[PDB]
Each structure stands twice: as structure tokens, then as C-alpha cells.
């Protein structure tokens, strides 16, 4: 199973660590290259929302599920989930099953309110899931097949309801939270909370002498 | 092709394990409706399907952790304990989000039901882990739907078990579990467990599936 990177693993994967320095108790600790971190987190944000037709198939179909739930149509929702489970078992899932439900609910009032308030596919669909959860539980485990289909989406949706995201979606999570705080959609990335949380998490972790000697300035 | 590759079709299976050969009955006496098809090397096929049977059942403690935990879920259902079952499935689901799974969660349930009458009856009648657990799933389904959906998490941990369990309730199995499927059915038809592999039906079925597929001339010449 393909585990989420820790903060330190993430920093190391994207070459974000830096010789910081001398804060007593911070011996054998690294800093973060903020500019590079900004770029990584900006890339994580993914595409602008620009009509559901342009979402990936998986983002489209799960959006449809959540919209159906927002509109109290559990049957339409469970039918997608069921076909996707069955057809995913059978070897490649039928994301077209969601199209009728998209057509019915994409301009419904509650959906239009979510789309109006978020600029990115990932922040739109997070708020669709948050909103669907006023109807019922809607766990990650209704859509287990998404992990191998779309890792970034899987992690974003598993962070809805959580206070701290996985580092691999900390950018879109920070942005989503910033959009809610601003009370409008934002095209300008608002990912500064991801940078500060990475720095904090990375400074908790001691490096080996070998690791410290690798730190570039 | 990754931990999530699609199931091999019969023809792909026969090619991966080098089971295709020239059909010497059709070479020496051709039939007009049957040109351009291959036969199966039956010796090698018996080996491959026997290799799919997996280990003998020899107490649940010796099963793979996934086989242990799913047996426990099915056991609970056979004994009408949906909550103990669902508790395992919940906890397993939780751990696959980001981590590695808590198969430990199944231990209390296995303790409680492994010597229950209905479990004892399944274990008595099947000799292999795969055939026991197939029958436990089949029995668990008298209590409710127990779809494979709910353990999609299995496919990356144990390909063979996942396909085996998705064939319970099917008439034709995937080629990659045709051996233990054939065995399982043979046990049910004999009315006892069988340690001797009973996989001949998987060989017959492969030959029949392979005869449906026309090869190209180039493919026909490359046969041995």
C-alpha cells in the first residue's frame, strides 16, 4: 500500500531542506527553502475549476455523488458508488454513470453556491464533500478505488473534516481553508499556511550528521 | 503492470505461462470450422493450476494475515454477529487510507468463532486455505450481502485471494484462480476435503477458452 509521505519525507523528496543557522534545543535541525516550497504547494493546487466537463473523470464522478447527496438523492449517489465499485472490481470503472446526475444537479442552488466560492477543482470538490456530509457519513471507504486512480484527490478528500492535511495536499488544503476564511474564491494561490506548517514540522525532526553535511546553504 | 493490473484473459494467461502449443489433433485431422487455433500443453497447465492452490489449511493462525482477518469477518457473519464483522471491515478500511492495515483487530473474533459449529463444518470439508475461505464467504452470504467492494484493499496485498473471493457466486472464474476454483468445486462435489489437487476442470476450461481465439498465421507458426 502506497503510504502518505511524512513532512520530512516530503521535504526530502522535493529538495526543500536547507542549512538554517543557534536556537538551543534545535541542534541537528533543518530549514526550508520557502520559495521552492511555495512552488511545490502551488503545483499541488491543481487546475482551476472551469466547468465540470473539464474535471478529470474521477473528479467529475465523485462531484456528482456529493451533489446528489447535497440534494437529498441518496439513490442517485449510491448508484454511482456501486457501479464504480463493481466496474472497478471488473477491471476499469465506468465514470460515465455519473453524467446523468451531473446534468441534473450541477446548476442546483447548493452546488452553485459551492462553485461560486472556490476557484480550483480540488477546493470545489472538497466543499462538495463537506456539504454532502450534512446528508450522511460519506466516508473515503465508499470510494476506495480512488487511491490508485488519483492519489492527490484521494488525499484531499481524506482531509475534509481534518484539521491537519497530509503534506502532499497541504497546498490545496491551505487554499481551500483560505477561500472559506475570505468568503470568496481566490485564483491567487493562498498557500502560506502550508509553508509555515512544513517549517514547523521539519524543525521537530533531527537529522543525522550525514544528513546535516548534505544541507546546501 | 502494477498491484492493480486487470485480470488476465485466458489467452493472456496461456501466453504468460507458455501453455500454448500446436494442436496435434487438428494438425493431423483438420476441421473446417476450427482453423488457426491453439492447444494447451496439459502437463505444464496442471503444474500452473496446482501452483495456484496455495497452502493447505492447517489452523487459522498459519493463514496469511489478510486471509485470517477476512475469515474472521465471514465467521462472524455465519454466526450472525454483523457488528464484529463490520468492526473488522471499518478498521481495515481506516488503515488503508494512509498506512499499513490492522489485521490484529480480527483476533478476538477468530478466538470466539473458529470452533463454532458452522465454521467447523466448512473447515472439515475443505483442505486448502483458499477453498476454506471461499466456503466461509459463501456461507457468510446467507446472513447478508458481503460484497468484495468492502475489501478492495485486498487486491494490492494478495492478488490471488482477491480474485478467489470475487469468484464466489460466479460460474466461470478468472484464469489466475481457475485452479483453486476448480478444486473448491471438486471438494463440494465429492462431499469431502481433498488434498490431492482436483484441477482438471481448469485445464479443460482453458482449452475451450483458448479454442475460441483465432491466431494470425505468424502466431500459428511460432507455436511449438
Numbering used by the authors:
A (entry chain A): 159 to 179, 185 to 380
B (entry chain B): 156 to 379
List sentences quoted exactly from the publication behind this structure:
Further binding studies were conducted with several DotM mutants, where Arg residues (single or double) on the protein’s surface were mutated to Glu. Five mutants were produced: R196E/R197E (termed “M1”), R314E/R315E (termed “M2”), R347E/R348E (termed “M3”), R217E (termed “M4”), and R262E (termed “M5”). Binding was abrogated in M1, M2, and M4, indicating that these Arg patches are involved in binding of acidic Glu-rich peptides. M3 and M5 were unaffected suggesting that they are not involved in Glu-rich sequence binding. The Lpg1663 and the consensus OSM peptide was also assessed for binding to the M1 and M2 mutants and binding was found to be also abrogated. To ascertain that the observed binding deficiency in M1, M2, and M4 variant proteins was not due to folding defects caused by the mutations, these three proteins were crystallized and their structures were determined and shown to be virtually identical to the wild-type protein. Thus, the mutations do not introduce structural defects, suggesting that the ITC binding results reflect an effective role of the residues in binding. Other interactions are between residues R196 and R197 of DotM and CegC3 E145 and a stacking interaction between these two residues and the side chain of CegC3 F146. Remarkably (given that acidic Glu-rich motif-containing effectors represent only a subset of Legionella effectors), the M1 and M4 mutations resulted in a significant decrease in L. pneumophila replication in the macrophages (up to 70–80%). However, in A. castellanii, M1 reduces intracellular growth by up to 90% (after 24 h) while the slight reduction in intracellular growth of the M4 mutant is not statistically significant. We observed that the M1 and M4 dotM mutants producing the reporter fusions Cya-CegC3Cter, Cya-OSSCter, or Cya-Lpg1663Cter displayed lower levels of effector translocation compared to the wild-type strain of L. pneumophila (Cya-CegC3Cter: 50% and 30% decrease compared to wild-type DotM for M1 and M4, respectively; Cya-OSSCter: 50% and 40% decrease compared to wild-type DotM for M1 and M4, respectively; Cya-Lpg1663Cter: 60% and 55% decrease compared to wild-type DotM for M1 and M4, respectively).
